[model samples]
Target chain A: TEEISKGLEDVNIKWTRLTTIDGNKGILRYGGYSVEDIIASGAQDEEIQYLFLYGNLPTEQELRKYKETVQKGYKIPDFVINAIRQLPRESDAVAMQMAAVAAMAASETKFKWNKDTDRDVAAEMIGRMSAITVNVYRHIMNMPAELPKPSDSYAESFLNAAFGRKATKEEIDAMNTALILYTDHEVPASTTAGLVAVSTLSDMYSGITAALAALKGPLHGGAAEAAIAQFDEIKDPAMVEKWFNDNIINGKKRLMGFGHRVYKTYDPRAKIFKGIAEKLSSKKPEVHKVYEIATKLEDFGIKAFGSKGIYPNTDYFSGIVYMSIGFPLRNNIYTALFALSRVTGWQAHFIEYVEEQQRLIRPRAVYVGPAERKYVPIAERK
Target chain B: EEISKGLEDVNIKWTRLTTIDGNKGILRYGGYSVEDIIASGAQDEEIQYLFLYGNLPTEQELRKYKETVQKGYKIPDFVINAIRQLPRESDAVAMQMAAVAAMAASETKFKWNKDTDRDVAAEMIGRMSAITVNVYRHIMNMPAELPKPSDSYAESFLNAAFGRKATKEEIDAMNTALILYTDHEVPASTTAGLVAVSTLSDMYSGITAALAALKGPLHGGAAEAAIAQFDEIKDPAMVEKWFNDNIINGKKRLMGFGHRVYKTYDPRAKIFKGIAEKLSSKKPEVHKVYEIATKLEDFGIKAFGSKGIYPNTDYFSGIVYMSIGFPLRNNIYTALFALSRVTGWQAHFIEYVEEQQRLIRPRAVYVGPAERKYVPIAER
Candidate 1:
């Protein structure tokens, strides 16, 4: 037995070729490409997904071929759509997405770890998730379902299906960047869940199903939605200081989107997303107030707590950008979109783990229960 | 960051539910010896109560608890439809995971709190049994069967899964099997579950996550793989040749003969071997498979016993499953493991949620290429 590591903090149990974070410096890279340069390069989710799965950036020919393969994957099975339709309208979008994905897993091509078919399977899952996410969100919000289009880009199809109309170039760019930024982040809880599930040599669908289940929790992918709810609660930028002082400092409530487990400085993704949030906020007045409140809160919180390595993470400005893109705050559909982008990261980790190690991830537990005791007959027991 | 590959020997959290003294091959749940409880003839539901509530229940308390669990045996139409929609080739445990996760989408009002935690756990434990049986029926192409309120949990499970009222011997064997598999220390499946619930995910999601881990070949799925090994061997006379050829020289894995935790014969494995033997004595065909398994176990111990390698719970549990007429395909053995272990998963989930209340986020040391600037597609 070795020393205890509660919550597995600082314990490195994986050798990955996917994303990595240097939390102290707040730097992140996906398959060796600095996240800042990737975002700055204006790579779409499709290109970034190929980068993650195949190890390097796709060239012109590879990108074209990869997008075609992803395009052809838009044909989701009928059973998945039926599964979503059967969910109660009050269902959380992330839960609905998870259910649909799990349902899809039943029909997934039987899992065997061959590198040739693995990337295609991962691509189809990433493709199908976009449609599943939009459909589940629309079904829950009482919006009409918009079918996928093979002619459109991944972001365009998502926006068209989600909004039931054409999206502007700016909206498409924002969606692309958001999905790219969320593509991966080392072994967060959700990624770890996916890795553990796929270690069974289960298919990517099961791995993503487990990841979605993990992401639905408020402490994980749900934080962006929680951050938006906080914005709505503050309503006005002038109230930011009072709210932060009372709720966070005085009431001891966790300031959602304020801290990170790994990042000791500003989240690199948050920095990129902050720019997008700033640009999109100008398009709508209601969204502007949310941006105002978020910026004010970030300003005050940074001044007071930045010395303690507490700053905004990715979720801080993401909600405003999602709001600008027409995603509702009503059903907490933000995490569903997060799940869609994160499929690449999860699948990448699964493929890498299977290719490299393929070991079962069974961790030990230190038992602290009472010593051996005799069991009495139930009738005589207290 | 420190490397503990496969997370071996890493204590992620403290568990009050079960402990495995691997060196001694002893297991306990809530300070009660599993063997003592099974020998006491206490039912599976009673064991579940002990695992969750931290002690044995009083008679009245047990009665009320069974009633609460019985109320959750009703399957929703969506879950049934979801199962029906799956391909017939779907793995049994995979289909069960789909059904359970589908249930979470419908739990619109469910949240984690002390007041509702026990109720929800009981509900899910009950729903899990119903779902398991219905998944079996769908795969078997048999009509779905629901549990009667009067039937005990094990009775209902066996009756539904077998599509008839089980014989007394069948019921007794099933009861013992359920109690034996109820809990182990936080194995991979349970840890996967605890990791999910550490984020305050609902019980169905937690169990669904556990099902995902358990469906893998190295965990609970090993039971299914073990039986497939016996199917490979097929004849008792060929055991020695098969053992020497595949296991000794060819470097093939003997799936059920070794465990990471147990260095001696697993306590549950010993109990299951007895049950398998009892059930096999009545059927000549099943006895053949048992003969092969017995010879294989003997040969395995002779070869690897000095290394502390011995039969684990999976080795004989598959025999119990096969002798009881469970199909070897579709991973029914592993799905049955999921059915029994959900009690433990939920029990551990509730305990960890109440106790630790911290997120289980571990780090991964970067072993990839260092950061490089992004290049334009044409430039590359």
Candidate 2:
């Protein structure tokens, strides 16, 4: 109790937060909405974004405006297009996309910090970051940059931008459901980076850029990429059986898609994504086999390795769904996820920042070095 | 013993280094040289850059090539024009540079994750970063941009480029001195950033940018500006007296004098003093003021603060060097220092990556609200 009180005091921010992390039960909730309720409601990704950021659901009229706003913001700038053209095709797609976004941010004066900035500037940043992620996918395919039609909702437009040509109604729904499920979580590494930048009083662009930079790390955003890589490396369904038997039953190598940092039983988000993956897989049998193999592998690893708490993460199923829906491998998964989900967190944190107006987040370090030493010329050493 | 041994196995990748407590000591050196040694023998700015990055001294042959490479990479014409267009009375040179540098990096293909299809891309990034710092001063009424020469000396070239007129003798002496001071063993923040970035297998640019980002606060690059701010606030004769009242009475902070990590004297202070004397011999008033500030700072630390924990080198630096006319404002201290240091550390860490590469992730203790009932749509 003492430690928890001290930690809250240290955070020193005020918010009408709906979400809470229950350590003992391993559950998360926002306001009156449990993680499971939001997942089960078939909420649109944009609605979840609104709920997490603004602390309330948008009215029908407000949702329409929000949708229009995001759709208009999806166009990629020419400089960014040129930068993407110049990028090596072999480069990590997500990393390149992030760099391109940061570069595009640099070209626009809107992202520059000003004393009397308006809220529209923040809105513009929030909107354009989504555009950058979708456009990065378009650019990789050498597709002409698509503009978001104002009529389409935010999730629908983003889907139209990335997978418009081949996206079926069913696939779009699944993708939108996945986006809603992934939209927001309590402060993670990337979110912390955003908060750190905000603490320095950096503008939205810098904060987002910092978040993207941190997210590019494998431990963070790169996890989904790793999950996909593991699936790909597992190759055939037979290999999945062989590899799982050898690695799990004997060698004891941990699978990428299983396990969570916080969850002792199952990641609620993963369970939600798993349902979506199964639904989508029913329409496509070959893909269904992959999910099946993954499930079996998880079950086997738990029983054989005595990994009682091991379960699929969001990463376990997200990449397969993304790839099936035509999102590029590696960077596109997180980039799209970030573009869709991070807005709510960023806005929520931004509101938190405005309320707190915290000074710089400077922490002390433990120094470990030589006590004292006289300067010696290189020639005099030894 | 068991607890200590357990901590040793905590897998430090992507985690905060928590042992450093400022109230416990001044500047602490884990496995690095003091700031003063490099300042005395090397150019102050170059040493500042090197301390942030950890690259060994290059051979004379390599030095020439490196200098030529750096000099060839000038700030883009647009960036130069942008700097020129800034309001002349702009007070925050550091802030201005920070903003502009981001713009400059954007203009080129030098992003966080550029494909290394061509060998020259990395080299171009290295050189252009140097150009950004150098051209920053040029547009600010320093001098015409100097072409890369065969000399390959970092500090000498910076001094020449910064000065309105560069004398051959002054240039040569400063070059040798700058090389000596270019690299410090390591500092806390630099090490901290490097450790963090290395966890991600981040490229050179990411690591360098992270270090530059960390240097912004008063804890790192702020010392120079802090000292300058202090001197501007106090006069020479009143310096000692002011320290007695404000510092002794706990009224105000004496910037650039004491360090949070170091326990003993800042070796850099002594070296910078010598450079200050050598540069400001003709300007007696400026030199005297710096001397007084240094003495007062040392006195305050010993008298009011802990024993042996005097100034950790940056305390008196900005006032001394800026008085000799270095553009020490607007976070220029960070940019200039970062230009060289980032390269060395990036090189070292890149080498480390080749040896042992693993993703850095650490666990965190979650604390937040408990799970609750879901709200119906009509509730609101």
Candidate 3:
């Protein structure tokens, strides 16, 4: 049978329940929690990552172990740092990071084998991915690479390594909350990529590589970066309103961080981000102003385009949060967004892969070309 | 509005067009010319690539230039020997895809930048991908790379390199085969990735990675091997008769035929390999047997199954041709496929990208544990 029809017929046939998005109700969920709850609970991002991947809230002991695992994995190999340094300074930071990660996988003997089915191997892959993201940033900034510490909690350690020689309690709390919020989402592009690679019974490196590839697209993890670009282009908050009116209202341009494919009313995560945007506004008014303008643009989009359900998406406010935390405009969003959120979806898909145990995902196409014909030599042709 | 609903309401729906068993009756035409006619005039595989990416055909001179370009971009020195050392039991094609992707970053000084023009990048990327697949087969003890000097034209080069020899009839026939199987409408996976990456501007590596991500299961590039395996189980003479008896009587799968989306026919499969069957009839029965099997399979699927099991186009018979003496399996297919499909889809997306151009960020329903107060380490 044709793959398209099979897909169409089977598209709605859900074999697994994805907590990220509610396909039935158009509600977006992440890690068995509502996007709103995760955003509102002030949970550390690492906790959410643990919840999504392991399918339960981590016990106090489990959480500590998880944090230590992540911390231990945070250090970058020297070869990877060298590779990252070789990348052009102006190269898309996320893409560069992805390439560097793939290169590291190539260099590592552990990734060479097809034996990615082991749990330890999988954990190593996840840890290596986190490390790659963190190191790529440090390499770009010419900062010293901080090895992940076992004593640190997940949020505390990531924050300590990424942002602090010694993270303050408040700083740790903020970073942890951010990590929690970013940890998991339903089947997004990158996670799906990971799942697909795993379905082929390929190694974790292949799966992660595929996920990284998907993340590179402007539509996926690139949203925050795109939102930042929009923010920079607007320059002044006063002009932001006008920019929204002309480009969003008149030209019908889609406002970044607003609107979703599944949610018709409002993205619960956006609402949470809105609150976070407000909280961080005092520290970084310029970034906060962008969030405010984005809200106005979203409201304007609803009023002018009659897209009442459309509102700021995760990207809309993520930049503000990252900027407040002192991340550069380019790779920060991807690094932060993917580092945590993908864990949940990736784990869920891995579970599904185990359940299905199918050979591979193969589909067919419709051929469109000439009918059987006699071959004429070039001299005799035409 | 939800992005999915918005797209549909705006008539920008993404549809999965199946080519394996030719279901959609969408006639492919370039301006005034039908795809078949284009195949007759141009190199079949080249035409396939052309249809996907809009550009002038690679001329005779351009063929020489491209060959030189391709030859110069050989597999990395370490990668060449690495291929030889790979486990013989390995799925060479999958290994090629993974290993090539793993090593690709090293070939260039500059990392992937989103703003880099796609065509220039695609050229190098496409060439590297081709080389990877070619070298993969060679290391696996399949065949040698078809150097440009051995052939005068693009199609001939593919046949000579990919096939054991470039016979006049086989070359022309294989050309049509390439033209027949190119690009279709974007599927769920590609659309998903495109939407995801659309959020980020100019992150091409991420997009390529996303495409690769979608290529695993229920999305992309898996059907070819599946169909080939099915074909291997049955003989040529038993094909039509077996399909008729099984499908018409008890209902069974006929392999390399039928589709999901299209109800009518796979246009490309309809035309491809026809010339080979006719020209090589007296020379060898292999091509004729494949043709017969394909026809029987199609008929059996339609007659037995509830029109659901139709031939979706894949690289099934394409592999059979390779087995008969076609040299490089994956590379020839990858290059020709890219040349045809990438351009049109990319163009279609360019307009969409220019419109909203935001990251495709979606939300999810959380299904985990309820909230709890955090305990201080001392308290715990």
Candidate 4:
């Protein structure tokens, strides 16, 4: 009778060999490698995804075949594309992606979850999710669907397929870093939603669809989109301090992208993304203005909230990097971008949990309502 | 370090909806005995109101609420078009998921904390029933059919599924079943749903998430597995030999016999047993099916009832559904289960949103290696 875990705070759910986040120390690790070292080593998209899904870093020979297999995963069935096209143009990218994945899951004849087939399922979903993200964005923007090219890396192919043009080397590197950073961070809300779904032995597509379902909320993945909207409201770097003092401090509005559930110091991903945002902002004037405004806001936000461990998290500058790399702010592609990277993490933890510790995630709730009473007939009711 | 794997003995939140007394085999919704509600012949709409709005609606209140639900019965064309784009052989549960997910996209500007939140929840409850029947018909290659403007939720739901007027007994069975399955105090699917709405996601997304969780073999998908097991036995004459061959020696797992929460006979299963028995008496084919099930139940009880692992809700649900003319395969079993369970899912969703709206973020202990340096691909 005394076992209430409100919001499940500090309540450990499972033991995972996936991402590890040390909040007080501000460290993040995937598998065993630090995020800083992985980004510094310039690992390709396929290599990092393989490390997460298959466990451990892949050698050159291992990565060569793995990259081809992942590249081949870019195939999207025509029915899924047709289903996406049918959605209204005003649809959020998160909703479109869930519909696409649900349609893909429906088109399958087998409802299966076996250890032998789970890895391939995870790999295929990780591969296909990027293409699905591109087409979902393109459909919402009224652009025709484009498939990824075989000759390019996954990040380059994604950017090319999305923008319908080749991306610069810098843009590719920036996206590669961003994707690797957001891959997995243990079980956040969306990943937990996904883990809960597949804990019932639901298929992988349903799991990923469930994850994206949670990502649409403003409290979760939508924070990046809200961050970009905040920058747009400030409009200029010169007005950043005034906007901060008025709308944020005086008006008591929530400053999105500045805080996280895990990170206590400056988020490691945010530090890296801050670098990319700086580099890319120099190439685009509009993005540079938004980045400068964001920079001033970050200074003020840290000065005000830094002592409380409310530092700039990944969403802070990841929005700027996404904007610089050609994701549109109006269509809310930032959160979908978060989902695109997080799907690998989602699939990784899903496969790991199912293989190692397969348990139904059913919890009890305390009954706090009325005591037992009789069901009076309608004629006798008050 | 302590771990709560399977979330056993962990209380996630407080609910005022339903209570399950597993040891005594009792179930109550809003303080009314489930048996009392069944015997009193309460309508499904009245139970839904009780769970969602805190009390059973009065007669006039029930009338206006049914009108509110009636207005939400129409499936939008875009949702239909999305489902139509899928292959005809799509799994019925996945089709329902895809359909509802597509409908979720139609709400481009869904906001919480509005007065219309309750309306959205009720609308989705009505639409869930519609989507369930529509997807079932679509997979069967049957033309889509809408309800003929009925005040009874079960009548419209059963009529649309069979594409004809439902018999009085059919409506009674369905109404009781929906009430029985409405709320079970935060099972996996309900928690999956509340987890979504905990983020302030819309009702449609919440339903879609719930459907995803419900599609698993261990949850609502148990309905399909239970029926599939019945079809394997084939006849009442084989029930003994098959039970001995499969259970007594072969070690084959029985699907619907035991439940995780209920150690005694599931209260809902008792009612479903009644419905199956009543329906089978009128039809010989249904009687054969019901006889095979009852015989197996007797054998199962003799073998394992002392251990307190008895038949749960999914045990006799398939017979009642199959007797009402749903196919033996193609996921319609679980799809119909979702149709009844959606009200309960949304009840939890709206309750969590209105009362205990906390983000459901649980922690995990990292058991991976200590932080290591990354090496280049060539060096590795």
The best candidate by TM-score is: 4
Interface RMSD of 4: 1.2
lDDT of 4 by residue, A1-382 (tens): 5567877888887889888888888888898888888888888877889988778888888877776777666898987887778888888888889899989878876757777877677777777887888888889788888877775488988888999988999999998998899998887878888888988888888988888888887678677788899999999899998899888898678888887777879998898989889989997899999999999999999999999999999989998898888888865678788888988889888888888989999888898989999898888877
Which of candidates 2 and 4 is the stronger one according to DockQ? 4
For each candidate, the alpha-carbon lDDT, in order, equals 0.84, 0.50, 0.49, 0.83
DockQ of each: 0.72, 0.13, 0.13, 0.79
Q: What is the TM-score of chain B alone in each candidate?
A: 0.97, 0.67, 0.65, 0.96
lDDT of 1 by residue, B1-380 (tens): 55787777888778888988889898888887777877788888889898878878899999999988887789888898888888878888888888888898888777888888898888788888888888899999988776666557888888878877787787888888889999888777888888888888888888888888876677756787778888889888889989988999957899888777888989898888888888987899888878888989988999898898999888888878777778787888888888889899998898888877888888887788887878887787
DockQ, 0 to 1 scale, candidate 2: 0.13
What's the lDDT of the predicted structure labeled candidate 4? 0.83
Model 4 residue A205 CA deviation (Å) reads 0.4
> True contacts preserved, each candidate?
0.78, 0.06, 0.15, 0.80
Give the interface RMSD values of the models in order: 1.5, 8.9, 8.3, 1.2
Residues B138-224 of candidate 4 have per-residue lDDT tens digits of: 877788765545758888888887888888888888788788888788788887877787788888888888888887887866666
Candidate 1: stretches off by over 4 Å: A241-249
Top-DockQ candidate index: 4
Error (Å) of candidate 2 at residue A33 is 2.5
Reference-based TM-score of each model: 0.97, 0.71, 0.64, 0.98
Off by over 4 Å in 3: A1-46, A60-86, A100-124, A142-152, A160-164, A185-317, A324-326, A331-340, A346-382, B1-41, B45-174, B187-258, B262-380
